[PDB]
Amino acid sequence: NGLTGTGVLTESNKKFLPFQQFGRDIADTTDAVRDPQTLEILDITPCSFG
Amino acid sequence: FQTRAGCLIGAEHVNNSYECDIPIGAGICASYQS
Amino acid sequence: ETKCTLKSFTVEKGIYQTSNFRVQPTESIVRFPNITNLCPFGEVFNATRFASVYAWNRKRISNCVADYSVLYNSASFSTFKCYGVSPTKLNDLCFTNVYADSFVIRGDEVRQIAPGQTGKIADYNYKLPDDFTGCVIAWNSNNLDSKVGGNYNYRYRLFRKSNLKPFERDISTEIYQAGSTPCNGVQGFNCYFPLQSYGFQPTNGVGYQPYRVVVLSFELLHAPATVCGPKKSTNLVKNKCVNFNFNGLTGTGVLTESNKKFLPFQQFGRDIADTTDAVRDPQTLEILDITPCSFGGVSVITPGTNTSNQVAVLYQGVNCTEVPVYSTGSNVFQTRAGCLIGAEHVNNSYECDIPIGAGICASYQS
Amino acid sequence: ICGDSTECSNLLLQYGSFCTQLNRALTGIAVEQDKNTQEVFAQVKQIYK
Amino acid sequence: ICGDSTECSNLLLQYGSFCTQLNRALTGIAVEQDKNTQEVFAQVKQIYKTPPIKDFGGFNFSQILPDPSKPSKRSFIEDLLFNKVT
Amino acid sequence: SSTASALGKLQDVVNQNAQALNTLVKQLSSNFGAISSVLNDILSRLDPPEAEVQIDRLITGRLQSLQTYVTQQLIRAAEIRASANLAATKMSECVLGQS
Amino acid sequence: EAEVQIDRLITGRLQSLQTYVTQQLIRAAEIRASANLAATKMSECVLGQS
Amino acid sequence: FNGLTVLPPLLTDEMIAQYTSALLAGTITSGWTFG
Amino acid sequence: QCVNLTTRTQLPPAYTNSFTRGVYYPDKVFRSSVLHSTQDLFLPFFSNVTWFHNPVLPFNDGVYFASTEKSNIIRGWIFGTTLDSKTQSLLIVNNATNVVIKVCEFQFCNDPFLDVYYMKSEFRVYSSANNCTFEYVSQPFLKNLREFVFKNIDGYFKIYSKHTPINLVRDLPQGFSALEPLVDLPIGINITRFQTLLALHRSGWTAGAAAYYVGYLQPRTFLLKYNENGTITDAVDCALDPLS
Ligand SMILES: *[C@@H]1O[C@H](CO)[C@@H](O[C@@H]2O[C@H](CO)[C@@H](O)[C@H](O)[C@H]2NC(C)=O)[C@H](O)[C@H]1NC(C)=O
Ligand SMILES: *[C@@H]1O[C@H](CO)[C@@H](O[C@@H]2O[C@H](CO)[C@@H](O)[C@H](O)[C@H]2NC(C)=O)[C@H](O)[C@H]1NC(C)=O
Ligand SMILES: *[C@@H]1O[C@H](CO)[C@@H](O[C@@H]2O[C@H](CO)[C@@H](O)[C@H](O)[C@H]2NC(C)=O)[C@H](O)[C@H]1NC(C)=O
Ligand SMILES: *[C@@H]1O[C@H](CO)[C@@H](O[C@@H]2O[C@H](CO)[C@@H](O)[C@H](O)[C@H]2NC(C)=O)[C@H](O)[C@H]1NC(C)=O
Ligand SMILES: *[C@@H]1O[C@H](CO)[C@@H](O[C@@H]2O[C@H](CO)[C@@H](O)[C@H](O)[C@H]2NC(C)=O)[C@H](O)[C@H]1NC(C)=O
Ligand SMILES: *[C@@H]1O[C@H](CO)[C@@H](O[C@@H]2O[C@H](CO)[C@@H](O)[C@H](O)[C@H]2NC(C)=O)[C@H](O)[C@H]1NC(C)=O
Ligand SMILES: *[C@@H]1O[C@H](CO)[C@@H](O[C@@H]2O[C@H](CO)[C@@H](O)[C@H](O)[C@H]2NC(C)=O)[C@H](O)[C@H]1NC(C)=O
Ligand SMILES: *[C@@H]1O[C@H](CO)[C@@H](O)[C@H](O)[C@H]1NC(C)=O
Ligand SMILES: *[C@@H]1O[C@H](CO)[C@@H](O)[C@H](O)[C@H]1NC(C)=O
Ligand SMILES: *[C@@H]1O[C@H](CO)[C@@H](O)[C@H](O)[C@H]1NC(C)=O
Ligand SMILES: *[C@@H]1O[C@H](CO)[C@@H](O)[C@H](O)[C@H]1NC(C)=O
Ligand SMILES: *[C@@H]1O[C@H](CO)[C@@H](O)[C@H](O)[C@H]1NC(C)=O
């Protein structure tokens, strides 16, 4: 929905309140999203590097 | 080999213990013998 | 100078750094190759016929002496706009592989010829690189390039799968499918010919009269120079701090005869840290050696304005060979730290008052 | 700085080596930390019981 | 920064007094180095000399006590140290 | 005499100083977004009003690099001074008397 | 002008990184001084009577 | 993580505890002679 | 005027080891006692180089052509897209006298050969050449290994050459030898394929032992070492082995 980024998406158990769309924790780092169609919470983690 | 510092290839894991010369990390290190 | 640097009218005893000294250049030298054949410019500028915009005429010119001044001062050009260089200095540079692109376009499209420009010609007929260096020339041609019968031989690309590449030519003439049905070489529904003709007529007003456009593109130090400009070459001078203009490469220093073993395809040498070290003169093919002129720092030794007003001068790390206001002063001493003027050497040994360096120092008595 | 962008990498390329010395300083700091711990704690030739 | 160009100097002149500070820092560093060496080594007031006869109860200091043959008046160990490091 | 690499500290100090000088002098060959990395070429192709734009980029890049070098030198000098004080104490205590 | 905007972002982020590195260096010097003091204390007061 | 990583220390906690244990046993049993 | 060849020596090509061949001077700047890192098109070390004992071969980006030939059987080369008059093509010949470089729309034959009458005059490579664009003449190029590197960059055709007598019988020598630049051409073509020319004894042709090696270039970074006299003496390939 216009919020773009690279990572890997898995299932998540966080309970969004019915009007948010995504969440962040510290320093504006998105961690969870809600898909616009199925309306479920997905968790984003970065692709591995080193 | 899989270590707390990551993954290591080209080295053989042994069950002995020697003095440390080339530090790797997490309390393990490598040496030349191979 | 010490007072000015310390921003005070009184100075206490010590040593202070004030400024630097440099040998100054004496004369100038210029070296260009013997080539003097005139360069063909009116042949392409006064060419009768110019190709279409999609088939822009491309010419390569080299091995000549080009005079841009006659092009610069002439008022026949309506638009004369350069990008990477100021026009007035085109007579001071020697290039290689000059490229000239000539075509004819409408009056209103001349603006589209520019780096980072978007339009119709700028992406479907002719593209210029973002870092393009050179110049663009445009002039009206409604007198001869416009026909009362309608000029239809001039065509431009109108449709393509994607935008072009810089300095890329497209000449393919294939039907374009604008929709979801195959064309099979039929210009019907959702199928169009990519080329569109023009309606150049003398009766048309400004913005529709034909205009001739030629762009000149250069390069900067990619090969031995082959196309130069009008400039006289002087004589060569050795062992003199002079400023030189070797084949368009400018600099300042002393030239020495060098024994470096060049090989017949190098044009100039270089050392660590990427500094131009040696050059080969075009007229003689001799390997020279560049060296920067002598320079260094200066320091003043004073016992304090409270006590006296006479001082000594130290030139740091400079041999007592090129001294030149204290040209003579007193006896001159040469030390591992440089050269010293205004103090007298003695062969005793006391404690150190004003440290100078290399285990020696000065004090007041003189 | 760039976050996996080609144009950003190309633009950053023309700043010379502003990044070799940063990593050099960080690695020096890390080696210093390891040496600090080793020299403050390792002071016996044997392990007594 | 400028490499002996007047225009560059004129442009740089409007950047304030950065260069005075930069030179002052380096001058402080150099003076500090000289003071460091002087305070480390200059610990005695007089230059003592060893006696010509050397009978120190059987101890042998010849490898450390300076050798007059060397032009720099250094000793064997000091020569080895100076040769070892670039 | 036989075994080498016993003087790692002094060699490391020399190497650090040499490396700092080397990178400082190598920084002179960067465009910093300008059209060239040499001043004479810019001055010999362009009129002043457009030349100052490039010269500003050159100036700011070189000046910023110079400040970085100076700061690193200050830190290293502080560390060396601490080591020198330790050496002076050691010579005063373990040479002029029995510690 | 995307190049101009990216250049502004690049110089800002580079300045921030430089600041962080310098602060890290200062803190590391302080910690090294503390560690040297700890080593001397432990050598002098644990392995012998002071 | 946004391009930054944390490296583990070379000496793990067990080894540090073992050093402390050895030091303390040595100072209990042998006095200062073991130094 | 040409005839088709009937002898079909059809067989899979051989493969051998490239070792450390194919190093040339990248720029025209003198240097001495300096290690220089440069990124350009090169032949990757220890690559699989094809060996022939005259098919059609794609040009790719660059071509490394080597031959330990004796009596100089090989003559020249052909470059182009379709090798017909419909498209511009390039032609290189190194005969007994000065070498001839041509750029025209020739009409080549299926089996471009030369024929040699023991009277050495025969030319049966192309039948027609209506549109010619470029011409050039230079000094002739010529137990003995000869190596050439062909590049086509920015409307410039670059040819590097190097010859050295050899004593080894079959395999490519395991030595190091930089390739000084030979010739540059300011001509821009859309070359995609190339051929090779032979000198058969028309006295009745007898030529089946034509052993040469062909390799392709890739973009990568090398580290070159210069000596005191400014001659490249050794090199290191970046992306070959972790130690590299
Ligand atoms: C194209 O031809 C015109 C002539 O109509 C040239 O203009 C004149 O050229 C002569 C050459 O001897 C000069 O003496 C005149 O001063 C030019 N101007 C006029 C108004 O007569 C023009 O120079 C030619 N184009 C180029 C590029 O040379
Ligand atoms: C300053 O310049 C003079 C003059 O060149 C140097 O004196 C020369 O020294 C070399 C080396 O000993 C001799 O080979 C020359 O014959 C000397 N020239 C003369 C005219 O006597 C002097 O060495 C230089 N000083 C320094 C510190 O380099
Ligand atoms: C102190 O030790 C040195 C060697 O370190 C002794 O010098 C040696 O003397 C013997 C006997 O003349 C020679 O054969 C050796 O060649 C000497 N060694 C060197 C390195 O020159 C010296 O004699 C000792 N001092 C005393 C008083 O015996
Ligand atoms: C250079 O020549 C080759 C052919 O030798 C061109 O490749 C053709 O490309 C078109 C467009 O994709 C295809 O329809 C043809 O089938 C290709 N030909 C072959 C034989 O595969 C190539 O486009 C040419 N390059 C340029 C820049 O003109
Ligand atoms: C050789 O060049 C001539 C001219 O450049 C080519 O003749 C052109 O052929 C095309 C074919 O459609 C015509 O549209 C042009 O009008 C012709 N031009 C002239 C001036 O006659 C000829 O085809 C070329 N020969 C080839 C490519 O084999
Ligand atoms: C080698 O090829 C050339 C050209 O195909 C033949 O003709 C020579 O061409 C050059 C070009 O200007 C002339 O200068 C020469 O005078 C021509 N003749 C000779 C003998 O060089 C040349 O005949 C060919 N040589 C052989 C032995 O076949
Ligand atoms: C590098 O150049 C030097 C300087 O010429 C060479 O040293 C001598 O070169 C001459 C040729 O002018 C030979 O006749 C000598 O035999 C060379 N001296 C020797 C080999 O000791 C040197 O050979 C050149 N090559 C190298 C690798 O240094
Ligand atoms: C020795 O080490 C290997 C792996 O390094 C392990 O699989 C094996 O069980 C060990 N042997 C013993 C006796 O512990
Ligand atoms: C250039 O001209 C001068 C004088 O005519 C001549 O001495 C010199 O050899 C010429 N240079 C070349 C490369 O021919
Ligand atoms: C410095 O100046 C004072 C006067 O302010 C004077 O009394 C003193 O003698 C002077 N010291 C010198 C000249 O050494
Ligand atoms: C300088 O040295 C000479 C001999 O080297 C000596 O005679 C003289 O007294 C010394 N002092 C002066 C001031 O000349
Ligand atoms: C080259 O490729 C062939 C494929 O048939 C293979 O057999 C051969 O081992 C390869 N050469 C090398 C050096 O790997």
mmCIF file of N, CA, C and O and ligand atoms in Angstrom, chain C residues 168, chain I residues 80-82 190-193, ligand 4:
data_model
loop_
_atom_site.group_PDB
_atom_site.id
_atom_site.type_symbol
_atom_site.label_atom_id
_atom_site.label_comp_id
_atom_site.label_asym_id
_atom_site.label_seq_id
_atom_site.Cartn_x
_atom_site.Cartn_y
_atom_site.Cartn_z
ATOM 1 N N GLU C 168 22.785 7.216 -29.579
ATOM 2 C CA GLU C 168 22.328 5.998 -30.229
ATOM 3 C C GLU C 168 21.444 6.351 -31.416
ATOM 4 O O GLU C 168 20.640 7.285 -31.347
ATOM 5 N N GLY I 80 32.606 -9.126 -38.507
ATOM 6 C CA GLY I 80 31.344 -8.580 -38.959
ATOM 7 C C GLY I 80 30.179 -9.209 -38.223
ATOM 8 O O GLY I 80 30.356 -9.964 -37.264
ATOM 9 N N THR I 81 28.980 -8.868 -38.690
ATOM 10 C CA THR I 81 27.748 -9.412 -38.132
ATOM 11 C C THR I 81 27.276 -10.627 -38.924
ATOM 12 O O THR I 81 27.152 -11.728 -38.378
ATOM 13 N N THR I 82 27.010 -10.437 -40.214
ATOM 14 C CA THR I 82 26.558 -11.509 -41.085
ATOM 15 C C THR I 82 27.557 -11.840 -42.182
ATOM 16 O O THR I 82 27.315 -12.775 -42.955
ATOM 17 N N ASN I 190 29.606 -2.943 -35.617
ATOM 18 C CA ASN I 190 28.749 -3.748 -34.745
ATOM 19 C C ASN I 190 29.162 -5.220 -34.789
ATOM 20 O O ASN I 190 28.338 -6.131 -34.853
ATOM 21 N N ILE I 191 30.477 -5.454 -34.783
ATOM 22 C CA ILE I 191 31.016 -6.801 -34.935
ATOM 23 C C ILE I 191 30.449 -7.744 -33.882
ATOM 24 O O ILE I 191 30.327 -7.395 -32.701
ATOM 25 N N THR I 192 30.096 -8.958 -34.317
ATOM 26 C CA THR I 192 29.610 -9.997 -33.421
ATOM 27 C C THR I 192 30.255 -11.359 -33.641
ATOM 28 O O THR I 192 30.203 -12.194 -32.731
ATOM 29 N N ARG I 193 30.853 -11.613 -34.802
ATOM 30 C CA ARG I 193 31.472 -12.897 -35.100
ATOM 31 C C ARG I 193 32.792 -12.650 -35.812
ATOM 32 O O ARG I 193 33.108 -11.522 -36.198
HETATM 33 C C1 LIG J 4 24.675 -6.152 -34.263
HETATM 34 O O1 LIG J 4 24.385 -7.238 -35.144
HETATM 35 C C2 LIG J 4 23.550 -8.252 -34.566
HETATM 36 C C3 LIG J 4 23.429 -9.350 -35.596
HETATM 37 O O2 LIG J 4 24.705 -9.839 -35.986
HETATM 38 C C4 LIG J 4 22.205 -7.653 -34.169
HETATM 39 O O3 LIG J 4 21.426 -8.657 -33.527
HETATM 40 C C5 LIG J 4 20.082 -8.626 -34.043
HETATM 41 O O4 LIG J 4 19.207 -7.948 -33.137
HETATM 42 C C6 LIG J 4 17.847 -7.863 -33.589
HETATM 43 C C7 LIG J 4 17.097 -7.052 -32.559
HETATM 44 O O5 LIG J 4 17.081 -7.705 -31.297
HETATM 45 C C8 LIG J 4 17.273 -9.263 -33.776
HETATM 46 O O6 LIG J 4 15.953 -9.165 -34.298
HETATM 47 C C9 LIG J 4 18.150 -10.067 -34.728
HETATM 48 O O7 LIG J 4 17.680 -11.407 -34.808
HETATM 49 C C10 LIG J 4 19.597 -10.061 -34.248
HETATM 50 N N1 LIG J 4 20.449 -10.773 -35.187
HETATM 51 C C11 LIG J 4 20.961 -11.982 -34.935
HETATM 52 C C12 LIG J 4 21.816 -12.573 -36.016
HETATM 53 O O8 LIG J 4 20.745 -12.572 -33.882
HETATM 54 C C13 LIG J 4 22.416 -6.472 -33.231
HETATM 55 O O9 LIG J 4 21.174 -5.836 -32.951
HETATM 56 C C14 LIG J 4 23.374 -5.461 -33.854
HETATM 57 N N2 LIG J 4 23.628 -4.365 -32.933
HETATM 58 C C15 LIG J 4 23.332 -3.093 -33.214
HETATM 59 C C16 LIG J 4 23.662 -2.092 -32.149
HETATM 60 O O10 LIG J 4 22.823 -2.765 -34.280
#
